[PDB]
Amino acid sequence: SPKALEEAPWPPPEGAFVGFVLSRKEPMWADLLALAAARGGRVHRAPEPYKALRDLKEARGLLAKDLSVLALREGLGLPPGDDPMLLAYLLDPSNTTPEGVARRYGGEWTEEAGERAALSERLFANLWGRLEGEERLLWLYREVERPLSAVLAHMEATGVRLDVAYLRALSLEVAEEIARLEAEVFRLAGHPFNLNSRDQLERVLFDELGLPAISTSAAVLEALREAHPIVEKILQYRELTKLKSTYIDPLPDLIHPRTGRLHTRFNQTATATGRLSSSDPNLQNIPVRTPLGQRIRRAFIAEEGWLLVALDYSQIELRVLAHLSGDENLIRVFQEGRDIHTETASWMFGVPREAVDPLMRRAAKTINFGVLYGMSAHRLSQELAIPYEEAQAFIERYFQSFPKVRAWIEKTLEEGRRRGYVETLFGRRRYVPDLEARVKSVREAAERMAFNMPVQGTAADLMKLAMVKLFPRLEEMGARMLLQVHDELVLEAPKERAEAVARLAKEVMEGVYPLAVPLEVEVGIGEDWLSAKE
């Protein structure tokens, strides 16, 4: 609340825990409604929240980096300080919101700024207790998590320029295809009807054309996409319409009046693995590698005499797997610069060396990516149309080739079975209690999380440590860090500094942490995100 003769006048003494209400928003768009800062029992309040920000040497407290985004907007240099959201996330990745951590560790997260400043003091003290008897998690808070919040802040306030001419042009292009698809669906129906009305779709599918399963479960559609050339046309209609109303149409609306750029929200404590995420737009969902997703990525442009430099960890998940499993054969695929899918197909087919693969080099790519989370043999047989027997053979043949990967899988399910959590190369853990559940499907899953977390998790902490390390150096050359999606970074360098920024960034990212295999980052320089693909 706080307590007793608690209220003081603004400003607080340094090291105080700030609190803050915003206008039902995301920072760059909201107004700072209230402001506050508890220190040693007292609650200082602000008279007028904005002038008050210049008192603060930094923002300590819950959601410290959203305050820094607001304040960066307003030309201030406020660094995000300590944040109990970052400590409670390290303690346990399922601690993703303010209200939840308060509900778990004690305290009400309420919508009154001095109470949220009080709470921040309390919750930091509680949590720093629980975490300072922990050397791998304290490393991670000082070397990765607290610096990244400053990096993320500048990212979210800088923004990316969009190409609005192009986005409106595209909208018309995709709306055209939507209308061609729909003429096709009407033709294969004899009459026009409403593709969106459930009444009418099941009247066609089930009555007019007497399809199988003939609703019961909603959206049944997907499964019976068989002989009739229409019920996949319904589908390609459902996703361009999903896409258009998601990534093309709303995006010029999301541009800032003060900036003329999009301000993508970057979240640090939202995922199970510890990957970063984006919120409006969610950049992870723009369909990558389809004709349309690369078409959406061209709408992301550089400032007017600047260039974009994209960077991309080549096969970070398999290289982490090689490293973590100590598999001499996977290690040496990479250490000597060989194609992973070719070499796998060479081991797995026992081809007289690398001799005329290409069907083989398809089977293998499918095993390679598929083992990671855990493609069962039936679906393996789906992508790879094959029998249960040849398919199970491809799987044990992958493990006869790479047997320390089988070692690691089992070492991991066992060691997580007995201690009750799994870790990252760096020490980040996810508690895995369901990994013994007698109910088949929830335990099946706990096991998938148990082997994914160390590989997707270590890949995540290596991107983050690369970001933290590059953010100084980019300022010494005046370039910006714009977007992080998947295993990619997008930078913005002035046209005259763009290849030199591109070399520093490959350098930093590749040498960031010593692994048994080389990390490889691809780098491309372009005026729009699609051209920087290199």
Ligand SMILES: Nc1ccn([C@H]2C[C@H](O)[C@@H](COP(=O)(O)OP(=O)(O)OP(=O)(O)O)O2)c(=O)n1
């Ligand atoms: N089960 C799967 C299948 C695919 N991917 C994708 C997402 C990544 O962006 C991509 C990166 O590797 P590629 O599949 O593109 O493989 P390479 O880049 O090695 O392709 P190749 O060597 O075949 O050109 O893998 C994945 O994560 N999980």
